[PDB]
Design a protein around this ligand. Structure first.
Ligand code: MYA
Ligand code: MIM
Length: 392
């Protein structure tokens, strides 16, 4: 005779209404399961980032996902998907990947994460699902005692570190024209343009060779020395840098990241550069269905201290442009970050219509130079940008 439940008081009961029924459920993806990797691939292929005119869409491949989402220390529960209960169809996704960065001006090192691949099926937008995905990944990261994050995005977000502008260097101008990526300037002809962008078919620098596992430690020292010039920079353990520069070195030969080094007579490494391949799907075109694209990644030179710096940097990027032809690259991209403004003009990079904002979650710092004029958004030559990190 009496109550069946244990005593409680108003403090013991939740203060927020219970959640109502949902047609969706959380689903932790396991990308080592090919079928699940296929689902993720499909979701982004049909629903990911497009340019302002809906002409092109980013196309991340299977190999690219395995490289980007599986760096040493990666966590499966940080690959968050959302599924329709009735059919089990994947309709949303977001990911966190470990990263360590340093703010050189205050000499502060932060073990953080990078948030990327936020995507919701086109037919499920404007239902405010995004805020939930963001809060859930935040929950899962905070659970591992990490409270800061680094990510990029469009203008739609408050207080960015800075804003950088995309730059484009045509390799196969004709194809770019054919798909509407570039237009013909007035009083100019298709042949005059092709002739102005033409490059040799073999690299010019002596000592240039593909980077190998033996070069990691030396290339890292070179990058660290070079990186001091920027405000925010990425740090790596030797295995992390190996992963990012060479990929999961199975039989080697990563098809997504390409690394090169320049060693002199004495066998000393004086320069290096890297870039990753991330094509564009051409939405509506009856002659081409894909645009080959390379993005400048991390690079360094020991001549930053000498007066031939700008010249050497231009030669270095020129050889990078030349090597990309071997991989079907139609246009080579980069941002106005790092010391890129030092070579943009002479290597014939043109400004694009896209911008990229950088954000730090839960961490305030002084704003940085984005390589462009704060007012006119135009590129400012030979300007060291505060941004020294590149995201995928
Ligand atoms: C310590 C760890 C912390 C970790 C977390 C750190 C923060 C990470 C933050 C994310 C880093 C992402 C890095 C990348 O991957 S940037 C790439 C983003 N992905 C795409 O652009 C793919 C194509 N678009 C889509 O798939 C959807 O439009 C998305 C999923 C973007 C929005 O879906 P939808 O169109 O259906 O909108 P909604 O009704 O559900 O939600 C409403 C909106 O949600 C907020 N919203 C919209 N777009 C973005 C955006 N680009 N960043 C941040 N917030 C964004 C915004 O506040 C607005 O609410 P409010 O303005 O009215 O208040
Ligand atoms: C990339 C990434 N990873 C993680 C996050 N993000 C950022 C995603 C959110 C921000 C965003 C949205 C969309 C894009 C794609 C985009 O708009 N790219 C532009 C960057 O400029 C572009 O390719 N533009 C082309 C095509 C434009 C077609 C019509 N819209 C262009 O400007 N071409 C001009 C080429 C020409 C310039 C002058 C010299 C000769 C070549 C990038 C980043």
């Amino acid at each position: 005779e009496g109550p069946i439940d244990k005593l409680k008081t108003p403090e013991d009961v939740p203060n927020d209404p219970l959640p109502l029924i949902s047609d969706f459920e959380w689903s932790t993806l396991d990308i080592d399961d090919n079928l699940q990797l296929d689902e993720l691939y499909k979701l982004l292929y049909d629903n990911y980032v497009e340019d302002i005119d809906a002409t092109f869409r980013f196309k991340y491949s299977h190999e690219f996902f395995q490289w980007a989402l599986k760096p040493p220390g990666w966590r499966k529960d940080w690959h968050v998907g959302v599924r329709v209960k009735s059919t089990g169809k994947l309709v949303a996704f977001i990911a966190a990947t470990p990263v360590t960065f340093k703010l050189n001006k205050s000499n502060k090192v932060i073990d953080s994460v990078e948030i990327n691949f936020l995507c919701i099926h086109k037919k499920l937008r404007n239902k405010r699902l995004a805020p939930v995905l963001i809060k859930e990944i935040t929950r899962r990261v905070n659970k591992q005692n990490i409270w800061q994050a680094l990510y990029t995005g469009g203008s739609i977000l408050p207080t960015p570190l800075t804003t950088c502008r995309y730059q484009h260097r045509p390799i196969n101008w004709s194809k770019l024209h054919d798909v509407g990526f570039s237009h013909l300037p007035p009083n100019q002809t298709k042949s005059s343009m092709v002739a102005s962008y033409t490059l040799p078919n073999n690299p010019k620098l002596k000592g240039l060779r593909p980077m190998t596992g033996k070069d990691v430690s030396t290339v890292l020292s070179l990058l660290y020395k070079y990186q001091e010039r920027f405000d925010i920079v990425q740090l790596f353990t030797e295995e992390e840098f190996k992963h990012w520069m060479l990929g999961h070195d199975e039989n080697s030969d990563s098809n997504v990241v390409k690394s090169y080094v320049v060693e002199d007579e004495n066998g000393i490494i004086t320069d290096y550069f890297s870039y990753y391949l991330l094509p564009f799907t051409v939405l509506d075109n009856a002659q081409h269905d894909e645009l080959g694209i390379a993005y400048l990644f991390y690079y360094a030179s020991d001549s930053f201290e000498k007066p031939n710096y700008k010249k050497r940097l231009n030669e270095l990027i020129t050889d990078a442009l030349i090597t990309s032809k071997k991989f079907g690259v139609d246009v080579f991209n980069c941002l106005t970050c790092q010391d890129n403004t030092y070579f943009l003009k002479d290597c014939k990079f043109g400004s694009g219509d896209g911008f990229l904002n950088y954000y730090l979650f839960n961490y305030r710092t002084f704003p940085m130079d984005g390589g462009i004029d704060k007012k006119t958004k135009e590129v400012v030559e030979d300007q060291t940008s505060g941004i020294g990190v590149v995201l995928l």
